[PDB]
Write a protein that binds this ligand. Structure first.
Ligand SMILES: O=C(O)c1ccc2ccccc2c1O
Length: 399
């Protein structure tokens, strides 16, 4: 076999590729305007989020059916193709297709299968393993942004980064597969009562799946609706652009770190209460920005918290889903669940911009984000796991 820490490395690789994909548009804003609108460019990012978040669902299903390796490597090919084709674009729709759909398609197919597979190697520590599958989305900015910046002084970014990302994803998918069906990597641990994981049709039909879905949409939407406004709130309060941006930049560090730390923490003490507390904290942050946000230090504290809570979602929801329905159907269960996040990624940033511009003030978007997080707090706290499924058909084998 292989040392079970390898899948952690693989998910790190794949998730880092996905982070580079989701971060690239920000480095591409100014070049594309110079040759030819920020909103026009941004529609490419929103299309990308939509396709990514939707394509996790087919990616999860196909991973569950025909294994995760084929899925991630196809995704690597699709992403490499789409990104690389963005270099040859000559119009806006060219970019919508190359980056928004092909690259988003490949990205979703890379993102999901490791998220499902890594915990299968770590039943003693499921949430930490998941965090390794999702931590790369924090890092992509750090490795790439400097490198992508180094290149333009822009098409070279698309082509060369597309190649490097394809290589990383193909390597990640090349070595990815669940443990052997029978023997689970361990060092430790009349007629019985045999339980079993949930089927995708059973999980999909469960009411708690959709409470979790709703909560996922709410939190995803809140964060995505206000994060882009953090620095503007600062500058609006009287800070220099340099100061405001410096402050908001701490968010990336917390968004990356929480993914591992929260995973480890709930592995140790359980999920529900920590998770609900994070949502509450996010709620309070949406409100508190109106008192802290006018100073580099205050604005930084809010950005760090917003980042901490936001990022935690992408470990804790898959971990929660794993607790409720088990790992055998996790490709399907969590892929369906992640589509909420695909939708929020599509609409949330736009809606936040619209509310601010509509009122000219930040009260509306931050208050709406606070309410969404409040509902999420409620759902996450109130929702306890369903009853473990009885496998009467294996139960009857005991004579
Ligand atoms: O944080 C992440 O891991 C992540 C991954 C994929 C996403 C797709 C659409 C919108 C937000 C996403 C997101 O926040």
């Amino acid at each position: 076999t292989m040392p079970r820490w390898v899948p952690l490395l693989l998910g790190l690789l794949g998730s880092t590729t996905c982070g580079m994909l989701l971060y690239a548009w920000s480095v591409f804003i100014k070049p594309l305007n110079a040759e030819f609108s920020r909103a026009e460019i941004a529609m490419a990012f929103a299309i990308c989020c939509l396709i990514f978040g939707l394509m996790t669902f087919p990616a999860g299903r196909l991973s569950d059916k025909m294994g995760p390796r084929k899925v991630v490597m196809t995704g690597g090919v699709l992403l490499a193709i789409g990104f690389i084709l963005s270099g040859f674009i000559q119009s806006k729709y060219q970019l919508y297709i190359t980056y928004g759909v092909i690259a988003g398609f490949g990205g979703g197919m890379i993102y999901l299968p490791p998220i499902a597979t890594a915990p299968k190697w770590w039943p003693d520590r499921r949430a930490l393993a998941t965090g390794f599958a999702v931590v790369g989305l924090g890092l992509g900015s750090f490795l790439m942004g400097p490198l992508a910046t180094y290149i333009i002084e822009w098409r070279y970014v698309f082509w060369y980064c597309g190649v490097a990302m394809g290589i990383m994803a193909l390597i990640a998918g090349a070595f990815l597969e669940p443990p052997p069906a029978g023997w689970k990597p361990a060092g430790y641990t009349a007629a019985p009562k045999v339980t079993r994981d949930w089927t995708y049709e059973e999980a999909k039909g469960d009411t708690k799946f959709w409470l979790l879905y709703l909560a996922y949409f709410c939190g995803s939407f809140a964060g995505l609706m206000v994060i882009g406004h953090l620095a503007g709130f600062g500058r609006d309060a009287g800070l220099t652009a340099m100061a405001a941006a410096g402050a908001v930049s701490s968010l990336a560090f917390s968004n990356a770190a929480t993914r591992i730390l929260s995973g480890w923490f709930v592995d140790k003490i359980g999920i529900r209460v920590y998770f609900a507390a994070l949502f509450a904290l996010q709620t309070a942050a949406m409100i508190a920005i109106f008192q802290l946000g006018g100073s580099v230090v205050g604005l930084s504290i809010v950005a760090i918290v917003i980042g901490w809570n936001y990022g935690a979602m992408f470990t804790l929801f898959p971990a929660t889903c794993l607790q409720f329905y088990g790992p055998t159907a996790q490709g399907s269960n969590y892929g369906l669940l992640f589509t909420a996040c695909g939708l929020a990624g599509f609409a949330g940033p736009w809606v936040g911009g619209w509310l601010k511009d509509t009122t000219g003030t930040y009260y509306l978007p931050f208050l709406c984000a606070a309410a969404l997080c409040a509902l999420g707090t409620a759902i996450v706290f109130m929702t306890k796991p369903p009853e473990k499924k009885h496998a009467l058909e294996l139960e009857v084998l005991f004579q």
